[PDB]
Design an enzyme around this catalytic site. Sequence first.
Site, PDB file in Angstrom:
ATOM      1  N   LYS A  35       0.867  -1.181   0.000  1.00  0.00           N
ATOM      2  CA  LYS A  35       0.000   0.000   0.000  1.00  0.00           C
ATOM      3  C   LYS A  35       0.904   1.231   0.000  1.00  0.00           C
ATOM      4  N   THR A  84      -9.546  -0.782  14.774  1.00  0.00           N
ATOM      5  CA  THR A  84     -10.087  -1.108  16.092  1.00  0.00           C
ATOM      6  C   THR A  84     -11.509  -1.519  15.809  1.00  0.00           C
ATOM      7  N   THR A 119     -11.576   4.730  16.647  1.00  0.00           N
ATOM      8  CA  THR A 119     -12.551   4.677  17.719  1.00  0.00           C
ATOM      9  C   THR A 119     -12.078   3.768  18.850  1.00  0.00           C
ATOM     10  N   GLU A 142     -13.422  10.736  15.055  1.00  0.00           N
ATOM     11  CA  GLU A 142     -13.528  10.847  13.619  1.00  0.00           C
ATOM     12  C   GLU A 142     -15.034  10.714  13.263  1.00  0.00           C
ATOM     13  N   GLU A 146     -16.981   6.244   5.133  1.00  0.00           N
ATOM     14  CA  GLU A 146     -16.150   5.642   4.115  1.00  0.00           C
ATOM     15  C   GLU A 146     -16.668   6.090   2.716  1.00  0.00           C
ATOM     16  N   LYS A 198     -18.213  10.214  20.764  1.00  0.00           N
ATOM     17  CA  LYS A 198     -18.135   9.337  19.575  1.00  0.00           C
ATOM     18  C   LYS A 198     -19.100   8.153  19.693  1.00  0.00           C
ATOM     19  N   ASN A 202     -22.586   7.685  17.229  1.00  0.00           N
ATOM     20  CA  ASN A 202     -22.761   6.491  16.401  1.00  0.00           C
ATOM     21  C   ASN A 202     -23.973   5.678  16.856  1.00  0.00           C
ATOM     22  N   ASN A 244     -32.894   8.084   6.320  1.00  0.00           N
ATOM     23  CA  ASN A 244     -34.122   7.344   6.602  1.00  0.00           C
ATOM     24  C   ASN A 244     -34.485   6.373   5.497  1.00  0.00           C
ATOM     25  N   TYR A 253     -20.360   1.065  12.617  1.00  0.00           N
ATOM     26  CA  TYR A 253     -20.396   1.964  13.767  1.00  0.00           C
ATOM     27  C   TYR A 253     -19.538   1.604  14.974  1.00  0.00           C
ATOM     28  N   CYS A 254     -18.747   0.538  14.941  1.00  0.00           N
ATOM     29  CA  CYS A 254     -17.972   0.168  16.125  1.00  0.00           C
ATOM     30  C   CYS A 254     -18.873   0.026  17.332  1.00  0.00           C
ATOM     31  N   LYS A 257     -22.479  -5.768  18.176  1.00  0.00           N
ATOM     32  CA  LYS A 257     -23.428  -6.066  17.085  1.00  0.00           C
ATOM     33  C   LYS A 257     -24.486  -7.120  17.301  1.00  0.00           C
ATOM     34  N   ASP A 258     -24.347  -7.886  18.353  1.00  0.00           N
ATOM     35  CA  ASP A 258     -25.253  -8.966  18.607  1.00  0.00           C
ATOM     36  C   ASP A 258     -25.326  -8.979  20.094  1.00  0.00           C
ATOM     37  N   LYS A 308     -22.334  -0.383   0.880  1.00  0.00           N
ATOM     38  CA  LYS A 308     -22.467   0.895   0.227  1.00  0.00           C
ATOM     39  C   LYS A 308     -21.680   0.815  -1.057  1.00  0.00           C
ATOM     40  N   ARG A 315     -17.622  -7.506   5.997  1.00  0.00           N
ATOM     41  CA  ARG A 315     -17.784  -7.718   7.446  1.00  0.00           C
ATOM     42  C   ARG A 315     -19.134  -7.235   7.974  1.00  0.00           C
TER      43      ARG A 315
HETATM   44  O1  LIG Z   1     -17.631   5.748  12.966  1.00  0.00           O
HETATM   45  C1  LIG Z   1     -18.079   5.329  11.755  1.00  0.00           C
HETATM   46  O2  LIG Z   1     -17.808   4.214  11.379  1.00  0.00           O
HETATM   47  C2  LIG Z   1     -18.948   6.188  10.847  1.00  0.00           C
HETATM   48  O3  LIG Z   1     -20.192   5.473  10.698  1.00  0.00           O
HETATM   49  C3  LIG Z   1     -21.055   6.073   9.748  1.00  0.00           C
HETATM   50  O4  LIG Z   1     -20.377   6.146   8.451  1.00  0.00           O
HETATM   51  P1  LIG Z   1     -20.751   4.883   7.420  1.00  0.00           P
HETATM   52  O5  LIG Z   1     -21.051   3.552   8.141  1.00  0.00           O
HETATM   53  O6  LIG Z   1     -19.498   4.679   6.474  1.00  0.00           O
HETATM   54  O7  LIG Z   1     -21.914   5.373   6.370  1.00  0.00           O
HETATM   55  P2  LIG Z   1     -23.461   5.385   6.876  1.00  0.00           P
HETATM   56  O8  LIG Z   1     -24.161   6.063   5.785  1.00  0.00           O
HETATM   57  O9  LIG Z   1     -23.665   6.201   8.225  1.00  0.00           O
HETATM   58  O10 LIG Z   1     -24.026   3.871   6.915  1.00  0.00           O
HETATM   59  C4  LIG Z   1     -24.221   3.375   8.235  1.00  0.00           C
HETATM   60  C5  LIG Z   1     -25.146   2.113   8.189  1.00  0.00           C
HETATM   61  O11 LIG Z   1     -26.512   2.492   8.141  1.00  0.00           O
HETATM   62  C6  LIG Z   1     -27.129   2.055   6.889  1.00  0.00           C
HETATM   63  N1  LIG Z   1     -28.011   3.144   6.443  1.00  0.00           N
HETATM   64  C7  LIG Z   1     -27.547   4.459   6.457  1.00  0.00           C
HETATM   65  C8  LIG Z   1     -28.358   5.480   6.062  1.00  0.00           C
HETATM   66  C9  LIG Z   1     -29.720   5.185   5.619  1.00  0.00           C
HETATM   67  O12 LIG Z   1     -30.478   6.114   5.247  1.00  0.00           O
HETATM   68  N2  LIG Z   1     -30.156   3.870   5.615  1.00  0.00           N
HETATM   69  C10 LIG Z   1     -29.302   2.842   6.030  1.00  0.00           C
HETATM   70  O13 LIG Z   1     -29.701   1.665   6.034  1.00  0.00           O
HETATM   71  C11 LIG Z   1     -25.917   1.774   5.956  1.00  0.00           C
HETATM   72  O14 LIG Z   1     -26.137   0.842   4.875  1.00  0.00           O
HETATM   73  C12 LIG Z   1     -24.981   1.196   6.973  1.00  0.00           C
HETATM   74  O15 LIG Z   1     -25.409  -0.087   7.363  1.00  0.00           O
HETATM   75  C13 LIG Z   1     -21.444   7.485  10.256  1.00  0.00           C
HETATM   76  O16 LIG Z   1     -22.313   8.084   9.298  1.00  0.00           O
HETATM   77  C14 LIG Z   1     -20.149   8.325  10.467  1.00  0.00           C
HETATM   78  O17 LIG Z   1     -20.444   9.588  11.016  1.00  0.00           O
HETATM   79  C15 LIG Z   1     -19.213   7.589  11.419  1.00  0.00           C
HETATM   80  O18 LIG Z   1     -17.989   8.309  11.582  1.00  0.00           O
HETATM   81  O1  LIG Z   2     -23.200 -17.036  12.386  1.00  0.00           O
HETATM   82  C1  LIG Z   2     -22.426 -16.091  12.644  1.00  0.00           C
HETATM   83  O2  LIG Z   2     -21.266 -15.977  11.929  1.00  0.00           O
HETATM   84  C2  LIG Z   2     -22.764 -15.028  13.757  1.00  0.00           C
HETATM   85  O3  LIG Z   2     -24.178 -14.762  13.804  1.00  0.00           O
HETATM   86  C3  LIG Z   2     -24.487 -13.734  14.775  1.00  0.00           C
HETATM   87  O4  LIG Z   2     -23.693 -12.487  14.567  1.00  0.00           O
HETATM   88  P1  LIG Z   2     -24.618 -11.544  13.699  1.00  0.00           P
HETATM   89  O5  LIG Z   2     -23.933 -10.288  13.302  1.00  0.00           O
HETATM   90  O6  LIG Z   2     -25.930 -11.251  14.613  1.00  0.00           O
HETATM   91  O7  LIG Z   2     -24.939 -12.483  12.434  1.00  0.00           O
HETATM   92  P2  LIG Z   2     -25.834 -11.998  11.183  1.00  0.00           P
HETATM   93  O8  LIG Z   2     -25.793 -10.589  10.844  1.00  0.00           O
HETATM   94  O9  LIG Z   2     -27.301 -12.456  11.469  1.00  0.00           O
HETATM   95  O10 LIG Z   2     -25.301 -12.858   9.962  1.00  0.00           O
HETATM   96  C4  LIG Z   2     -23.957 -12.489   9.630  1.00  0.00           C
HETATM   97  C5  LIG Z   2     -23.029 -13.724   9.748  1.00  0.00           C
HETATM   98  O11 LIG Z   2     -23.502 -14.863   9.060  1.00  0.00           O
HETATM   99  C6  LIG Z   2     -22.375 -15.710   8.667  1.00  0.00           C
HETATM  100  N1  LIG Z   2     -22.698 -16.234   7.361  1.00  0.00           N
HETATM  101  C7  LIG Z   2     -22.591 -15.434   6.230  1.00  0.00           C
HETATM  102  C8  LIG Z   2     -22.948 -15.914   4.991  1.00  0.00           C
HETATM  103  C9  LIG Z   2     -23.431 -17.262   4.921  1.00  0.00           C
HETATM  104  O12 LIG Z   2     -23.775 -17.742   3.844  1.00  0.00           O
HETATM  105  N2  LIG Z   2     -23.509 -18.007   6.062  1.00  0.00           N
HETATM  106  C10 LIG Z   2     -23.149 -17.504   7.260  1.00  0.00           C
HETATM  107  O13 LIG Z   2     -23.251 -18.200   8.245  1.00  0.00           O
HETATM  108  C11 LIG Z   2     -21.146 -14.823   8.697  1.00  0.00           C
HETATM  109  O14 LIG Z   2     -20.196 -15.381   9.603  1.00  0.00           O
HETATM  110  C12 LIG Z   2     -21.638 -13.443   9.191  1.00  0.00           C
HETATM  111  O15 LIG Z   2     -20.844 -12.932  10.267  1.00  0.00           O
HETATM  112  C13 LIG Z   2     -24.238 -14.292  16.134  1.00  0.00           C
HETATM  113  O16 LIG Z   2     -24.604 -13.337  17.109  1.00  0.00           O
HETATM  114  C14 LIG Z   2     -22.782 -14.626  16.296  1.00  0.00           C
HETATM  115  O17 LIG Z   2     -22.694 -15.372  17.486  1.00  0.00           O
HETATM  116  C15 LIG Z   2     -22.219 -15.487  15.136  1.00  0.00           C
HETATM  117  O18 LIG Z   2     -20.786 -15.358  15.130  1.00  0.00           O
END
Ligand SMILES: O=C(O)[C@H]1O[C@H](OP(=O)(O)OP(=O)(O)OC[C@H]2O[C@@H](n3ccc(=O)[nH]c3=O)[C@H](O)[C@@H]2O)[C@H](O)[C@@H](O)[C@@H]1O
Ligand SMILES: O=C(O)[C@H]1O[C@H](OP(=O)(O)OP(=O)(O)OC[C@H]2O[C@@H](n3ccc(=O)[nH]c3=O)[C@H](O)[C@@H]2O)[C@H](O)[C@@H](O)[C@@H]1O
Lengths: 389, 389
Positions: A35, A84, A119, A142, A146, A198, A202, A244, A253-254, A257-258, A308, A315
């Site tokens: 890179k 992070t 973060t 920050e 992205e 922060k 988020n 919306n 969003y850091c 998640k579950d 996006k 991830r």
């Molecule tokens: O700390 C971070 O990681 C950043 O997270 C987001 O930035 P980002 O995730 O790249 O872009 P977003 O547009 O905010 O998307 C956030 C999530 O919400 C979803 N989303 C967003 C907007 C919307 O109208 N609908 C929707 O489903 C996106 O697909 C995604 O899953 C925040 O907008 C930033 O301010 C922050 O710094």
């Molecule tokens: O099965 C998993 O990998 C994860 O599912 C959830 O984490 P979560 O973010 O709530 O999962 P989802 O958003 O509902 O599904 C995403 C996950 O599904 C898995 N995945 C993706 C694609 C696929 O075809 N099959 C599959 O199992 C991936 O590991 C991915 O992390 C559980 O809370 C975690 O314990 C578990 O690690």
Amino acid sequence: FMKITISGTGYVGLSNGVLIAQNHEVVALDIVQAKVDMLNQKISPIVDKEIQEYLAEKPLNFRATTDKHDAYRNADYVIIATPTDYDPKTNYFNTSTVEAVIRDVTEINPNAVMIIKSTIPVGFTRDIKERLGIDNVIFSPEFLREGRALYDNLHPSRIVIGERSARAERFADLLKEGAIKQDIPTLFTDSTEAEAIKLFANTYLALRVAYFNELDSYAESQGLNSKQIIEGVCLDPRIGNHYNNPSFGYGGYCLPKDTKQLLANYESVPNNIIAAIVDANRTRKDFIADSILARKPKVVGVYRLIMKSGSDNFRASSIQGIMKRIKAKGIPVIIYEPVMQEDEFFNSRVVRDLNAFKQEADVIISNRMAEELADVADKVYTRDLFGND
Amino acid sequence: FMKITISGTGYVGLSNGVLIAQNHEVVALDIVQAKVDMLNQKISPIVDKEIQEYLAEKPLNFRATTDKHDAYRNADYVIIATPTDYDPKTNYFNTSTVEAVIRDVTEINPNAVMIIKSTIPVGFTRDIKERLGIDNVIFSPEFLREGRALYDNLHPSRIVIGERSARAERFADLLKEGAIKQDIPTLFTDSTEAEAIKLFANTYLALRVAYFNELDSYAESQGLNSKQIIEGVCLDPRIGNHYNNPSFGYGGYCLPKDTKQLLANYESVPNNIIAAIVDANRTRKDFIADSILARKPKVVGVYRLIMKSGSDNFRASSIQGIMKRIKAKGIPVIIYEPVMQEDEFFNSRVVRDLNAFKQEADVIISNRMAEELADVADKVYTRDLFGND
Ligand SMILES: O=C(O)[C@H]1O[C@H](OP(=O)(O)OP(=O)(O)OC[C@H]2O[C@@H](n3ccc(=O)[nH]c3=O)[C@H](O)[C@@H]2O)[C@H](O)[C@@H](O)[C@@H]1O
Ligand SMILES: O=C(O)[C@H]1O[C@H](OP(=O)(O)OP(=O)(O)OC[C@H]2O[C@@H](n3ccc(=O)[nH]c3=O)[C@H](O)[C@@H]2O)[C@H](O)[C@@H](O)[C@@H]1O
Ligand SMILES: O=C(O)[C@H]1O[C@H](OP(=O)(O)OP(=O)(O)OC[C@H]2O[C@@H](n3ccc(=O)[nH]c3=O)[C@H](O)[C@@H]2O)[C@H](O)[C@@H](O)[C@@H]1O
Ligand SMILES: O=C(O)[C@H]1O[C@H](OP(=O)(O)OP(=O)(O)OC[C@H]2O[C@@H](n3ccc(=O)[nH]c3=O)[C@H](O)[C@@H]2O)[C@H](O)[C@@H](O)[C@@H]1O
């Protein structure tokens, strides 16, 4: 006169690096030789319009290296922007890259002022300042997205530095000086406050998206028109017509998640709100997957694994949880993801040719609508309403 | 030429009644002879600046009565604004006053077009239109705040009528014509959509307040400064610096309020979001009460049982849940509430004299700060930061 070092060259690192390099010596440090090599050739290693163009068309005092001694030497500020996030296996928030960069700088140039942009958990700064016995660590959140990384820095909503001091204002001026936007609101606070700012910013954004996704689920299951309902709700100026657009679930969003990540870190985060977005998201993916399975498909086609447009993140992409649910039922899935080299993802075939994909899938699901799919719209399942984010 | 009848004369009823009576014949129907009597004397029976003044200073074609036959006769529109809410004992959403007014109008003047302004459950209109076999029922959400009732109608965020038709636009024009604000955004939809627009708009407002109250709890327990954190968070234009004043908990909105009401009605409402605001609110009151008990008080003084200045609602007032929690521990409570005639509330003495109250309480708790308390500020516990709502 001033030298700034960016440790970590992801979009957060390059964003700040390029911003500051319009008027100061900026040296970008990374651990990936390749890179770094491209950066030195003025080629951006990530997709982001402004970064690619500022790096190749504007005069910048910028360079990259994999050498920490040369990178940190005589640095006045070292901006930390390494990875992070919550670890998906242990569920603990992983701040090791940041811990590492701090030991290094402390070791190599204990006179540089370290600004953490990555973060971190609330209380990290105060605690590490104490565990190591240093004092030159300041957190500054920050807020960029992205793909609009440099853009959000050229026109920031605001600047927050986790320290009330002259050195903290000196840094804020670096950021204001590089920006296009004028009069950037600037707030100085302690570092724990700044980390919480922060976390909560988020949390709210995730909450808003989670809310519009329940609203959307509710309408769909009740036979109502989502768009009229959202229009009506958003005409209230306290709610607003922005951020919306319904989707298959939010990601990123850091934030825990579950419920396992929430549980491993409850008490570092606002428990009820997080529990709420986490449950809503899980629920939204069940609803969406159920809704797709009801169309009794033979082969489901997943159109793009990134969330996006122009992203490089799989991830945090909610389409994954949908695949997971549809595959649980035995339905075959094929994927169309150009950015993906693998020929199969969790054993689902990754189809390289858009036309073969269009023909094999009876149902094509896609998080946002896309032009390329206009000719197969009749079999496309998306909850996108507005065409934004 | 046009006659409008308001059934129910609370602030929603009078708000609309007075708005429309600037240009049309308005007849207000209520079941309380005494309120009606005052209205006919041009005396407002509720506190609301503009209602009191329009009723006594502006020329209005307005009158009130307890006679439904005279009230409904030749009415073109009948606006229904009678009490609806979740019953605190059975936990079912109670729409009986509205059911009643509809049977009456159907019976007495089946040609009037009924506009429901009282909040009702999603699907109520479609269902009753069918259960009775009528067609002249339209839902149109109310978005006004108690105390600014007429004000919010003179300058509405928007107008939503639950019907796409000429009669629906005729009504919308009545509302636009009486308003001061021009170009009011107007949306026509089906009635189930319109009911959902009301449900979700309120859900979001409750969600926002719940969120700022967790943020506030989080800061307090972590030793952080709430105000700097909120400033920082709200500088994000997607969040905004409005409707963000921490309190002892929210109340109202015609939303299930505890998990029993949520359970008795899950499936009429967005389950995860409601569960979230309900848990956050319960949690906020535990935190606040715990925080007060830690000051090891001998006598706690509850300053005002109403929630908002000039209100007449105790029901939905979060200070109640705090009292409840402090009394659970055996701490004596005294109350200062001029609007309350009772000499004791759940057995806590209601002290009539502000000075005696100030002297007897070692800790005075108050949802919003007040001028009258400035001289005892040192023993006042409030989480109010901005002095608004
Ligand atoms: O700390 C971070 O990681 C950043 O997270 C987001 O930035 P980002 O995730 O790249 O872009 P977003 O547009 O905010 O998307 C956030 C999530 O919400 C979803 N989303 C967003 C907007 C919307 O109208 N609908 C929707 O489903 C996106 O697909 C995604 O899953 C925040 O907008 C930033 O301010 C922050 O710094
Ligand atoms: O099965 C998993 O990998 C994860 O599912 C959830 O984490 P979560 O973010 O709530 O999962 P989802 O958003 O509902 O599904 C995403 C996950 O599904 C898995 N995945 C993706 C694609 C696929 O075809 N099959 C599959 O199992 C991936 O590991 C991915 O992390 C559980 O809370 C975690 O314990 C578990 O690690
Ligand atoms: O359908 C309804 O009942 C009405 O509910 C609220 O009107 P209201 O409750 O009279 O006034 P709010 O200012 O919205 O107060 C709502 C609750 O949130 C609390 N709140 C509000 C605002 C704030 O900044 N902080 C805060 O704690 C209030 O004390 C109260 O518990 C909405 O604002 C109206 O749009 C809606 O029509
Ligand atoms: O004890 C109750 O009356 C109610 O408490 C909760 O309903 P909730 O709204 O969550 O109660 P809080 O906000 O925590 O406290 C408000 C209630 O406390 C009661 N109260 C008020 C003042 C007081 O000194 N003692 C007291 O018990 C009042 O009935 C008032 O409704 C429960 O969910 C309900 O099952 C129960 O009816």
